[PDB]
């Protein structure tokens, strides 16, 4: 089939009971869909996201980015516009590591 749309409420029954070990903590609270994507991303899955807010989709993106340095691998982020291309770099420069 290769395509499974997960229901907005059906899968999630718990969030902290699984993932016993911590993750990239956020000052604010995570929404249901951000944790929903993080849950799949932990199994090295492929994720598609369709939302409205811009930074709301970036939570899983920086989850993967923080997860890479725990795996020492490299990740590629593609932004097809010059203004947005450097803002995320600036956001993650003082935030952590080297970009």
């Amino acid at each position: 089939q290769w395509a499974i749309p997960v229901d907005a409420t059906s899968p999630v029954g718990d969030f902290y009971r699984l993932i016993p070990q911590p993750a990239f903590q956020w000052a604010f609270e995570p929404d249901v869909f951000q944790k929903q994507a993080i849950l799949h991303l932990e199994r090295h899955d492929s994720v598609f996201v369709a939302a409205h807010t811009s930074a709301g989709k970036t939570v899983v993106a920086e989850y993967a980015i923080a997860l890479a340095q725990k795996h020492m691998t490299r990740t590629i982020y593609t932004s097809p516009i010059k203004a947005l291309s450097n803002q995320k770099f600036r956001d993650f420069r003082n935030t952590f590591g080297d970009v």
Binding site: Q21, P22, F24, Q25, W26, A66, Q69, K70, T95, F96, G97
Partner: peptide, 10 residues
């Protein structure tokens, strides 16, 4: 030990 325990990167 700092980084391993901390494990935050933020």
């Amino acid at each position: 030990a700092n980084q391993k325990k901390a494990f935050t990167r933020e």
